């Protein structure tokens, strides 16, 4: 007797805790990269594995170690709760995406590699080379009590 | 001697005043914070009552001429021009001008046109006292000064207002502002000061709604041995499962009526009984702060700045309206009329300049006025003129 349930976790403004607002423009911090949305083999049914907060390389391929780290995926099309894209893309279809690179404050608890592993020291210093304040001074990491 | 030895420092007096404000009420943001206020039912009401009497005053306006024959002709032409704007009336102008009570500032541009056919063919009317909304102005620098911070050269309007979905010289603009001295171009909105009180007032009202919803006093609690609960969960087709499903529906419908009662087994295993039914209550003391009087203090705090605090129960409210009327009249008497007469080369001495007088905001007392005329009249101090006769 299923009781259908839907859920979400996190926002856009919890992976990016703050910006540096370049007066001269608004696109200073970001870079636009092109990636494959739906898996290369899965049918046109699978919600892709691009949860916001994954680390991607310079050419858009998802990161796997500290070596291939360039930016943090923050595109609106993969934010939690944004799930009306299921059949809109064919397998292997390749779409632009947005990465945040420069002058940003980053939550250390959200950053992950493509597999799911949490970011490590090597990845932290790699990102922090771009001028990103990777910080772990977050309040809210324990829910309700239990 | 005949030489200035200083500056008004318009460009500094501003830049100190923007720092000394909470950041949600600095120029480019105050335009949004005003319209995100107003939707408070005490803030709207204060502004609405203020505009009620401002419109009334500038409805039955009058132009008072001088003594010479030249002034009387000029006064008639002024009345025609002010009552024949194409698509505009002074009531609409008054209710647009009075917006500085929301944003500290108001901009009106004067446009003149020639007459084609009419009583004063060849002269110049005023086409429209074009209101420039504060929201359509420049969000960066709205007002531009000299190379020094001494005076004002004009007002800037954003380029995004010329689209559907530039600097205007100061000589063409009528500026009205309130709450500050002559050195504060961006006047202090009366909502500055109120802001902190409005922030608190809102938060408290939110706590009252959630607090009343969550006061589960007298809620029904049932205790059942876990043997029955566990058996139902693993044996959906057992007698325990049927009784559990019955309880989940019967307990929801348990109201008070003509047949309400409870019947429970009286078994006992330890110092505590197996089955029980009690109505919960707060084990201690309830809330203490009495959030009701917190809100009342903040409401009177907000309305006092607008002079409309009497609704919480010559006056303060009537005197407050006169302030707004006088500011508008100064711009109308001293910026438009002298220029309007200059275009139609009507040059008069100082004592012969006609002026516009606003109407009266409080209605005349028939009982008081009628017996006041007798007392003056019975002695003979009231002149016999049509002016007195027409007052009836």
């Amino acid at each position: 007797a299923k009781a259908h349930v839907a859920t979400l976790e996190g926002n856009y403004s919890d992976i990016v805790l703050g910006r540096v607002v370049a007066f001269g423009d608004t696109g200073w911090n970001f870079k636009e990269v092109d990636m494959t949305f739906i898996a290369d083999d899965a049918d046109a049914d699978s919600k892709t594995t691009l949860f916001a907060g994954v680390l991607v390389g310079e050419d858009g391929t998802p990161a796997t170690a500290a070596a291939g780290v360039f930016g943090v995926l923050v595109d609106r099309k993969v934010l939690p709760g944004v799930d009306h894209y299921i059949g809109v893309f064919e397998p292997g279809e390749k779409v632009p995406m947005v990465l945040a690179v420069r002058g940003l404050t980053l939550n250390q608890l959200k950053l992950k590699y493509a597999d799911g592993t949490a970011i490590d020291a090597a990845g932290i210093q790699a990102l922090e080379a771009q001028g990103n304040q990777v910080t772990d001074k977050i309040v809210g990491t324990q829910f309700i009590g239990s | 001697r005949m030489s200035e030895q200083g500056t008004f420092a318009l460009a500094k007096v501003q830049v100190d005043s923007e720092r000394m404000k909470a950041e949600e009420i600095r120029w480019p943001h105050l335009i949004g914070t005003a319209e995100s206020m107003k939707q408070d039912a005490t803030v709207a009401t204060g502004l609405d009552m203020l505009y009620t009497f401002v419109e009334k005053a500038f409805k039955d306006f009058k132009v008072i001429p001088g003594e010479s024959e030249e002034s009387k002709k000029a006064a008639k032409f002024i009345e025609y021009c002010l009552k024949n704007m194409e698509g505009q009336t002074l009531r609409q102008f008054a209710r647009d001008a009075a917006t500085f009570n929301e944003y500290g500032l108001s901009v009106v541009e004067k446009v003149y046109t020639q007459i084609a056919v009419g009583e004063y063919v060849g002269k110049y009317k005023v086409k429209n006292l074009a209101f420039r909304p504060q929201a359509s102005l420049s969000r960066t620098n709205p007002i531009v000064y000299n190379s020094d911070g001494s005076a004002i050269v004009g007002i800037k309007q954003s380029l995004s207002a010329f689209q559907n979905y530039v600097i205007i010289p100061i000589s063409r603009v009528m500026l009205m502002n309130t709450g500050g001295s002559s050195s504060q171009a961006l006047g202090v909105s009366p909502l500055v000061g109120c802001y902190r009180a409005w922030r608190e007032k809102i938060l408290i009202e939110n706590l009252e709604v959630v607090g009343a919803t969550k006061d589960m006093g007298g809620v029904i609690e049932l205790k059942i041995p876990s043997q029955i609960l566990n058996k139902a969960a693993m044996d959906p087709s057992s007698p325990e499962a049927d009784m559990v499903r019955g309880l989940m529906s019967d307990a929801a419908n348990a109201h008070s009526g003509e047949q309400s009662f409870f019947m429970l087994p009286s078994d006992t295993k330890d110092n505590a009984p197996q089955y029980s039914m009690t109505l919960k209550g707060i084990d201690g003391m309830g809330k203490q702060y009495s959030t009701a009087q917190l809100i009342s203090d903040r409401k009177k705090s907000i309305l006092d700045r607008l002079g409309a605090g009497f609704i919480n129960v010559q006056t303060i409210h009537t005197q407050f309206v006169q302030r707004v009327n006088e500011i508008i009249l100064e711009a109308l008497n001293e910026n438009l009329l002298p220029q309007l007469l200059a275009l139609n080369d009507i040059r008069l001495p100082e004592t012969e300049m006609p002026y516009v007088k606003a109407g009266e905001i409080v209605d005349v007392d028939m009982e008081g006025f009628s017996k006041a005329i007798q007392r003056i009249g019975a002695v003979g101090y009231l002149p016999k003129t049509p002016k007195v006769i027409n007052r009836v």
């Binding site: 839907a6 996190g10 919890d14 009590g145 239990s146 | 919803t213």
Partner: protein, 46 residues
């Protein structure tokens, strides 16, 4: 021994998960005598 004490309403993650649940029924749904359009029928904000 990691989740002994649970306090509700002190985390954004836990607040929105309950708030956005389509099956959730909260206090702001008290229809009373008969339903009226002045009272929401869904827990999540528009």
């Amino acid at each position: 021994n990691s989740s002994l004490v649970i306090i509700g309403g002190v985390r954004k993650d836990e607040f929105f998960r309950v708030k956005n649940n389509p099956n959730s029924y909260n206090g702001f749904m008290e229809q009373g005598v008969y339903p009226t359009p002045a009272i929401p029928k869904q827990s999540a904000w528009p």
